[PDB]
């Protein structure tokens, strides 16, 4: 998720937020009308910091939402880990059965991504999601297809 971000769209969103706040450097300096560099620099830094914190928590929430689809289906159902480990401990062999089909993970991903408000809210989040999307679907198909035997 984080590798797909780009500098241009993030800068564009930051500039859009600045325009929405009406706190451009020209207006801010023309309003303050003082030479106290430390105070104005701290004000600008905190203005940026609030946006940085909000972006970080938004990305955290989206990342947890994406993670929530895969995790339950790992230890149980198709492609279970403890069954793999006890196969290794008993014999060292791991029989595996394969079939190419769509399952709960793929439908969960489809029902999750297609109607998430954060994509419409932020350009960077939407572009990162659409760029990294195919990998998520391929990983979901990989999770669904395999099944360690009983």
């Amino acid at each position: 998720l984080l590798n797909a971000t780009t500098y241009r769209d993030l800068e564009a969103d930051w500039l859009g937020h600045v325009a929405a706040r009406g706190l451009q450097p020209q207006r801010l300096v023309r309003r303050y009308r003082n030479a106290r560099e430390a105070d104005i620099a701290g004000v600008a830094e905190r203005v940026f910091d609030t946006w940085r914190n909000t972006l970080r928590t938004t990305l955290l929430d989206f990342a947890h939402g994406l993670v929530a689809c895969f995790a339950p289906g790992g230890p149980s159902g198709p492609s279970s880990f403890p069954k793999y480990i006890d196969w290794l401990t008993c014999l060292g062999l791991v029989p595996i059965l394969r079939k190419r089909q769509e399952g709960g993970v793929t439908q969960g991903l489809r029902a999750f991504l297609k109607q998430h408000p954060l994509t419409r809210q932020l350009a960077t989040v939407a572009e990162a999601a659409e760029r990294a999307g195919p990998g998520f679907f391929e990983l979901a198909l990989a999770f669904d297809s395999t099944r360690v035997a009983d």
Binding site: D13, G16, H17, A20, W51, T54, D61, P117, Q121
Partner: peptide, 7 residues
């Protein structure tokens, strides 16, 4: 004014 986490 808009913020990333807001509705």
């Amino acid at each position: 004014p808009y913020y990333p986490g807001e509705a």
